[PDB]
Amino acid sequence: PRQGSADIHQFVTDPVLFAKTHTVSAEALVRSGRLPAEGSAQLVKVGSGLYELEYTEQSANDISSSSIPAYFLGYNGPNQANAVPAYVDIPKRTIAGNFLFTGTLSGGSLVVTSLDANTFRVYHDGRVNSSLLYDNVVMAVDYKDYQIAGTAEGLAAAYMQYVNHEWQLVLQRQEYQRDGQMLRLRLRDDEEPLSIQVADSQVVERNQAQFVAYREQIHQQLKKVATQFEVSISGVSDGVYTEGEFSPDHPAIAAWAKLCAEVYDRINADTKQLVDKRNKLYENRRNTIRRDLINQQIKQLNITLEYYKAQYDTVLREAGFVEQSWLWQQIKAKNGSAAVVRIDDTAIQGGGKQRTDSVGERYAISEAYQRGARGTGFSDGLRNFREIEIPGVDDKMSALEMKRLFLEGKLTSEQQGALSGRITETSRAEYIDKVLRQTAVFSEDFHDAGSVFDRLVPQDFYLSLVGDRSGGRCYPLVRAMTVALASGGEAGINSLVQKLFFASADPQAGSSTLLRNSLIKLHSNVEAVQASTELGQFGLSEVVSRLAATTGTSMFALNTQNHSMMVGSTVTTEGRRYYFYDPNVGIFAFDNTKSLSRAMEQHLVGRRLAVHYGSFGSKSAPAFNLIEIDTGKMAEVPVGNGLNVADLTRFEELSSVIGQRRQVEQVMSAQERITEDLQLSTALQAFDAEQWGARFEAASTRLAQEHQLDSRWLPIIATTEEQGEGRYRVQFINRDQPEQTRWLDTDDSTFVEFRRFVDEHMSVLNEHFTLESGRMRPRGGVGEAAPVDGLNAGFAVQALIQWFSDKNRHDAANGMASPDLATALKVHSYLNFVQMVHGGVQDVIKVTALVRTALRGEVVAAQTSFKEFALSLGHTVNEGVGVLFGGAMIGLDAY
């Protein structure tokens, strides 16, 4: 046991300052199975301002224990299908102890409710947004309260303290962070690392409104993204919840689920083309001297892929969560809370009426999460388990039959504690006698059966320091390994066994903690049951013949009654290699199924291990289950903190992947600063318009200087035409009253490309606004979204008019005889907006008579003339500077 630091007394003395200035982590409260209701809590120091809690049995009356009376709460599981939450009952106005602790929150909720006049019931619920489901909620922390915005990632420690005669729900937001090719915890620095709730009444409404808004918003996000990949959103909406239990792919959400699965396929098929290339790269990296030549290409492919992950996995995950949450809320709204929280798990039910889970697996689940309470009688059972006696049990029962009777749940909590202790003692005595003492001979049996590659795995790596250490790690490890092998072959297997070795040599380093906390959450993750198909029982010979029958890569677990070997085949290149993997020994491979069967028979029956693993049927010719794992889906199950199992299952260190996920979110946040800064979006539209102004003025000047003309002649932009291919002519008018117009052979494209540029904006103004009696009405009012780009085009047109004026008044100040093009542009804009000019062919005699009568100043149409329009387009835009910028527009408006 770790010694612990007397700083516990500082923490007791000023818990708020301590939690503000030091990171209080909770990891040992996750990897401890079924904590007591009541126990001793202590800190242990690990680094600079970094402390970990632990449960311990030592008395607080040896103050050198650095420990205090506190109430623990067990960790609840991560499967959204869970009806049985973790809860414990604690007094209002406590005397016995003044703190309450729980396992680190990652995708769950802590909900405090008032059970009666004198006691709170605190629930650790593994579902997101759980505070909506309970009733009489007075305090709560939901996933959203500690989520990092714009990401799926989140991590926070939550605990309760009795201070100033009331309970306070204390939330300490954290993250994992990279620090020189290592990981550490730290307080989150981008927001206030601590926040506090006293007991309140309105919390339900305050959450529910936010959830409704957030769900609407995420549905907008998904509609957007689906549109970006051309998927039809037609008819996608919530089916009214009609009947039945919670399920994934329930008809009510089926449209959303399908849309997610498909949009995911549109990127998964895309990335697979680079995935293959990356594998080719690693296969050449392993086999060549000049590693650093190609390694950077590995880095660039990683960056490319992780961009796509960061950009879309978060969206798909959040859509799944908001859909599961809305489903559960409908189930509550129709069937009442008693359908959505259950007091105990003994009313056995699930996604199917039975799921035939091995006793081993259902026990490990029953001993790596807390569901319901654990009264002090259970702790007394455990502390006294050598004295206690249990009916119908004796020392010569197998560990399996004890595990079964314990999962009968009929015994008292003190009896279940005693039987659990006896189970762990017998289990580890048997694992020692059967496997640790004989890890040697297995290597040689597999060798001289003819194996072609092997990697032993650390005997010592345990996912929990307590309970049966031996058998709990098997079910997640086989699910990780089969992904490793299917996705990366011998290099994957090497990287993963290296990871296990390091994580067992340094059992308290940050990475080994994150790995332990990321193999857990594979015990009962319903996505893995989505990635499964329990085929029948088979005799070993039949299993071998089935492997011989497979085409393409395929994998199988054996999931024997108390253990999980793995077996499978790869066929991609180098012939067909057949693999075998026993988590107690190592992974082995073979070139031919005869050799494979000759080895696996010797191993499982020749040394009777099939009987120690409790296989079915006769001792000879044992029968196993098998489960045709779909590595296409199993790889993508979430293990919290946004990691897919593939991510813990890769060639590089975890601090590399997390580093990359930092850097590419720096890059994406910088890019997002560029994509939606509407100030630069409009200022560049202004700069573009002014640049077209200078281009058109330069072109007009050149044309008016190759020919002979003066300031009285205006180019009529509305009439430029192509005089056949490749060559242009332009009409000019004497702006005075006379009819005098002259056509100039022009040969310059800008006299039509400027008209194209300006008619694009004028079609916006003609679409968003109407000109009435010489003022412009925003269509549908200012309250529509139209002004937000109608005025954005208007600011550009107005800045072009005021460009030409400020150039004319620059020439007049330093010269003479500017052509005064602002009148030409005003008469174009007027006639186009009033639709007197329009696209397509117009009679030149008509459009010229229009331009002429506009230049003569009298009203053409709309009971208005072009200078009134040119005023109204300044007025509306100067009002609209409020919408576009908020006013206070230095350098422009306050003349």
Partner 1 sequence: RLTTVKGEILLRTHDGKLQLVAVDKDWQQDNLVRLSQALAEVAGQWRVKGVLTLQGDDTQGWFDVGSGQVFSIGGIPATDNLRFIGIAVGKKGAYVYNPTDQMLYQVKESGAQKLNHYADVERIGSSLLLQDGGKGDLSPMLIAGVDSVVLHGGAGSDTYRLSQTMWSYYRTVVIDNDDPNQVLDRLIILAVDAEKIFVSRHEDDLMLTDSVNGTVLVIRKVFGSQAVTHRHLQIDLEGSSSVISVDHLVKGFTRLGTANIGLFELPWAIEL
Would you put residue 33 in left (φ > 0), alpha (ψ -120 to 50) or beta?
beta
Alpha helix (H) residue ranges in 602-749: 609-612, 631-634, 654-675, 678-706
CB 103 within 8 A of CB 75: yes
Residue with tokens 């300006």: 758
Q: Which is nearer to partner 1, 245 or 806 (CB)?
A: 806
Q: Is 205 helix (H, G, I), strand (E, B) or coil?
A: helix
Nearest to 685 by CA among 771, 778, 758, 779: 758
Tell me the window of 50-58, 299-307, 416-424, 861-869 that interacts with partner 1 (CB under 8 A). Answer: 299-307
Q: If binding means CB under 8 A, how many residues of this protein chain bind partner 1? A: 48
Tell me the window of 62-70, 133-141, 665-673, 726-734 that interacts with partner 1 (CB under 8 A). Answer: 665-673
Q: Which is nearer to partner 1, 308 or 538 (CB)?
A: 308
Tell me the window of 57-65, 214-222, 426-434, 678-686 that interacts with partner 1 (CB under 8 A). Answer: 678-686
CB of 891 to partner 1, least distance (A): 4
Rule CB under 8 A: is residue 691 a binding residue for partner 1?
yes
CB of 710 to partner 1, least distance (A): 23
Rule CB under 8 A: is residue 894 a binding residue for partner 1?
yes
CB 68 within 8 A of CB 41: yes
Q: Which is nearer to partner 1, 465 or 871 (CB)?
A: 871
Rule CB under 8 A: is residue 783 a binding residue for partner 1?
no
Rule CB under 8 A: is residue 189 a binding residue for partner 1?
no
Nearest to 873 by CA among 761, 718, 763, 765: 765
Rule CB under 8 A: is residue 572 a binding residue for partner 1?
no
Tell me the window of 466-474, 659-667, 833-841, 842-850 that interacts with partner 1 (CB under 8 A). Answer: 659-667
Rule CB under 8 A: is residue 879 a binding residue for partner 1?
yes
Rule CB under 8 A: is residue 299 a binding residue for partner 1?
yes
CB of 761 to partner 1, least distance (A): 17
Tell me the window of 121-129, 328-336, 679-687, 755-763 that interacts with partner 1 (CB under 8 A). Answer: 679-687
Binding partner 1 (rule: CB under 8 A), the pick from 441, 670, 849, 859 is 670
Tell me the window of 65-73, 273-281, 319-327, 526-534 that interacts with partner 1 (CB under 8 A). Answer: 273-281
CB of 887 to partner 1, least distance (A): 9
Q: Which is nearer to partner 1, 132 or 664 (CB)?
A: 664
Q: How far is CA 518 from CA 78, 211, 891, in A?
A: 11, 28, 56
Binding partner 1 (rule: CB under 8 A), the pick from 708, 814, 815, 841 is 814
Q: Which is nearer to partner 1, 664 or 733 (CB)?
A: 664
Kindly state the DSSP code that residue 524 receives in the 8-state scheme. S
Burial of 32: CB neighbours in 10 Å, binned 0-12, 13-18, 19+: buried
CB of 303 to partner 1, least distance (A): 5
Binding partner 1 (rule: CB under 8 A), the pick from 810, 829, 860, 880 is 810
Q: Is 138 helix (H, G, I), strand (E, B) or coil?
A: strand
Q: How far is CA 859 from CA 635, 776, 862, in A?
A: 73, 16, 8
Tell me the window of 7-15, 383-391, 660-668, 712-720 that interacts with partner 1 (CB under 8 A). Answer: 660-668
How do 50-56 and 23-25 pair as beta strands? parallel
CB 604 within 8 A of CB 622: yes
CB of 715 to partner 1, least distance (A): 20
Rule CB under 8 A: is residue 773 a binding residue for partner 1?
no
CA angle, residues 629, 634, 640, in degrees to nearest 5: 150
CB 713 within 8 A of CB 819: yes
Residues between 578 and 617 that touch partner 1 (CB under 8 A): none
Nearest to 37 by CA among 94, 93, 78, 77: 94
Nearest to 598 by CA among 615, 578, 628: 578
* Number of residues written out for the chain: 895
Rule CB under 8 A: is residue 303 a binding residue for partner 1?
yes
Residue 864 phi, psi (nearest 5): -150, 160
Q: Write the DSSP assignment of 406-432 as a string of letters.
A: HHT--S-HHHHHHHHHHHHHHHHHHHH
Rule CB under 8 A: is residue 284 a binding residue for partner 1?
no
Binding partner 1 (rule: CB under 8 A), the pick from 592, 602, 853, 878 is 878
Rule CB under 8 A: is residue 270 a binding residue for partner 1?
yes
Question: Which residues fall within 8 angstroms of residue 527, CB to CB, at 6 or more apart?
Answer: 633, 634, 636, 637, 638
Rule CB under 8 A: is residue 228 a binding residue for partner 1?
no
Rule CB under 8 A: is residue 293 a binding residue for partner 1?
no
Rule CB under 8 A: is residue 679 a binding residue for partner 1?
yes
Rule CB under 8 A: is residue 686 a binding residue for partner 1?
yes
Tell me the window of 33-41, 372-380, 528-536, 675-683 that interacts with partner 1 (CB under 8 A). Answer: 675-683
What is d(CA 455, CA 252) in angstroms, rounded to the nearest whole number? 48
Rule CB under 8 A: is residue 429 a binding residue for partner 1?
no
CB 81 within 8 A of CB 54: no
Rule CB under 8 A: is residue 895 a binding residue for partner 1?
yes
CB 112 within 8 A of CB 160: yes
Rule CB under 8 A: is residue 682 a binding residue for partner 1?
yes
Residue with tokens 């959103």: 233
Q: What would the x/- binding string for partner 1 be over residues 304 to 343, using CB under 8 A?
A: x--x------------------------------------
Binding partner 1 (rule: CB under 8 A), the pick from 240, 348, 813, 841 is 813
Residue with tokens 């709560």: 140
Buried b (16+ CB within 10 A) or exposed e, 137-176: bbbbbbbbbbbbeeebbbbbbbbbbbeeeebbbbbbbbbb
What is d(CA 214, CA 220) in angstroms, rounded to the nearest whole number? 10
Rule CB under 8 A: is residue 707 a binding residue for partner 1?
no
Tell me the window of 346-354, 471-479, 542-550, 871-879 that interacts with partner 1 (CB under 8 A). Answer: 871-879
Question: How many CB atoms are closer than 10 A to CB 542?
Answer: 14
CB of 772 to partner 1, least distance (A): 15
State the DSSP H helix or E strand holding residue 754, giving kind and residue range, or none if neither. Answer: helix 750-768
CB of 881 to partner 1, least distance (A): 9
Type of residue found at 74: G
CB of 91 to partner 1, least distance (A): 51
Q: Is 174 helix (H, G, I), strand (E, B) or coil?
A: strand
Rule CB under 8 A: is residue 687 a binding residue for partner 1?
yes
Output the six-digit token pair for 747: 């040969």
Tell me the window of 124-132, 494-502, 683-691, 852-860 that interacts with partner 1 (CB under 8 A). Answer: 683-691
CB of 879 to partner 1, least distance (A): 8
CB of 679 to partner 1, least distance (A): 4
Tell me the window of 81-89, 237-245, 268-276, 519-527 that interacts with partner 1 (CB under 8 A). Answer: 268-276
Residue 561 phi, psi (nearest 5): -55, -25
**What stretches of 754-881 adopt beta strand conformation (E)?**
769-772, 775-778
CB of 698 to partner 1, least distance (A): 9
The count of C-alpha atoms lying within 13 angstroms of the C-alpha of 24, restricted to the half-sphere facing its C-beta, is 31
Calculate helix-pair angle for 821-833, 678-706, nearest 10 degrees: 120
Q: Which is nearer to partner 1, 719 or 818 (CB)?
A: 818
Rule CB under 8 A: is residue 743 a binding residue for partner 1?
no
What is d(CA 817, CA 801) in angstroms, rounded to the nearest whole number? 18
The residues of the shown chain that bind partner 1, judged by CB under 8 A, are 270, 273-274, 277, 296-297, 299-301, 303-304, 307, 663-664, 666-667, 669-671, 673-675, 677, 679-680, 682-684, 686-687, 691, 695, 806, 809-810, 813-814, 875, 878-879, 885, 888-892, 894-895
